């Protein structure tokens, strides 16, 4: 079993929306995936009250439930945590029990702020068990001027990113409004990027098998 | 449209 | 003097962006406006340190700075609050000392999450001192579907919502990258709505001079 | 939608 976590205190970064589509894509490939919802508002959990979900949903009553993961969700090929859109103990708890930490960030500059506090929680864990890290550009738009600013916001931290940024499309919203992922849509522009982004995520685990 | 387009990126990088 | 707050515990709700453009619209209209940033990440402040804003910018270190606003920024005409993106005491603080509360919500299902939070702290405040409130549609995209799914939510709550909304435009963002607001550019699609939305706010306090 | 009205 392995644990993937999506953390970033900033609420416009699309942590919840990403998970739904990546985990859904992860199940279609034969993997058994389980996702933990840590948001006190329980979004990934309310959405999944729509039946349609290729993954398993487990809500979090507190950080005590995010800690004992491998003791419970040990049977799944993957365990994914929908980050908490708040500066909290969550981020601290997650990194401590992960094998990969994905960090969603958007083009808007002021949306990269907390990208920092997270990157420094990993730098701490390196002392016990280095946790792999990667930046995931989401809601991308063709704004050169704006993307060079975000391209650099990453560089400094000194962590690799993903050559496959999640683009901004209306399908990523309407799909969630009904209770589906983007794989339940004719739209193939979105299914593409994710199917290639997901592939990347697995490559990180192949180098070591 | 002008003025401070880099100074933010520059610092979002520092944070 | 009157206090105004932009509180919505959710993150992509455009609180900060709204505050800037709306405040500018008010200052360039004559009034003296002072804005209090309460973000632990100081995004609005990090913004203000570059292009000169039209309003006065401040920075809070804790709720201690919010509770005393009627004292510090008393010489001003309006005090605006860029509420923290967290579910903190700031939301609790703000309402306690405000003549008006604006709740920025966006056309999405995951956004109306803690938007309901603010609504109850206002009803809870209604006991000691009635505090007005209005929802604010932001980043309005073109989807009749979602707009109603929100519009309905914005109704059950039992509060009004400005007839005008803040549309999604690459200018509202591009403008924050440089350092300007939206009135420091030729785009007249935004320069108008902000001005109209602002005229509403002025009417609200107009009915306090009437009664 | 049904849950959207709800929120
Ligand atoms: N790739 C995308 N394309 C289009 N809309 C998106 C995308 N990613 C996110 N959104 C929308 O942006 C808003 C914020 O996304 P969301 O996934 O709710 O963020 P979160 O990380 O879930 N927010 P929070 O719970 O506060 O941490 C939502 O309304 C989404 O519908
Ligand atoms: N009307 C709009 N049109 C286009 N983009 C917008 C608009 N309003 C906000 N945005 C963008 O969406 C992001 C979210 O806006 P922002 O005002 O930062 O939300 P907040 O609620 O202020 N975020 P936070 O301080 O983390 O709680 C910003 O980075 C903006 O670039």
Residue numbers in the entry:
A (entry chain C): 1 to 209
B (entry chain K): 142 to 156
C (entry chain D): 1 to 211
D (entry chain Z): 150 to 156
Q: Please, what does the article write about this entry?
A:
Crystals were obtained of the complex formed between the TP228 plasmid ParA and ParB proteins (also called ParF and ParG) in the presence of AMPPNP. TP228 can replicate in low copy number in E. coli, and its retention depends on the type I Walker-box cassette that includes the small 206-residue Walker-box ParA protein and the 76-residue ParB protein, which is composed of an N-terminal disordered region that binds ParA followed by a ribbon–helix–helix DNA-binding motif. Crystals of the TP228 ParA–AMPPNP–ParB complex took 6 mo to grow, and the structure was solved to 3.65 Å. The structure revealed density for only ∼15 N-terminal ParB residues, consistent with the subsequent finding that it had degraded during the extended crystallization process. In the structure, the ParB fragments dock as helices within the crevice at the ParA dimer interface. The formation of the ParB–ParA complex buries ∼450 Å2 of protein surface from solvent, consistent with data indicating that the ParA–ParB interaction is weak. Strikingly, the ParB helices interact specifically with the ParA subunit arrangement found in the nucleotide sandwich dimer state; comparison of the ParA–ParB and ParA–DNA structures shows that ParB cannot dock in the dimer interface of the conformation that ParA adopts when bound to DNA without clash. Thus, the structure indicates that ParB binding stabilizes the ParA nucleotide sandwich dimer conformation and not the DNA-binding state. Although the ParA–AMPPNP–ParB structure is low resolution, the best fit to the ParB helical density places ParB hydrophobic residues pointing into the ParA dimer interface with Gly16 juxtaposed next to ParA residues Val1149 and Pro109. While the Arg19 side chain position is equivocal due to the low resolution of the current structure, this fit positions ParB Arg19 proximal to the AMPPNP γ-phosphate in the ParA active site, suggesting that it could aid in the stabilization of the transition state in which the γ-phosphate becomes partially hydrolyzed.
Walker-box partition systems are ubiquitous in nature and mediate the segregation of bacterial and archaeal DNA. DNA segregation by these systems requires, minimally, a centromere site located on the DNA to be segregated; a nucleotide triphosphatase (NTPase), typically called ParA; and a centromere-binding protein (CBP), termed ParB. A distinguishing feature of the Walker-box systems is that their ParA NTPases bind and use nonspecific nucleoid DNA (nsDNA) as a substratum to equipartition replicated DNA. In these systems, ParA–ATP binds nucleoid DNA and uses it as a substratum to deliver ParB-attached cargo DNA, and ParB drives ParA dynamics, allowing ParA progression along the nucleoid.
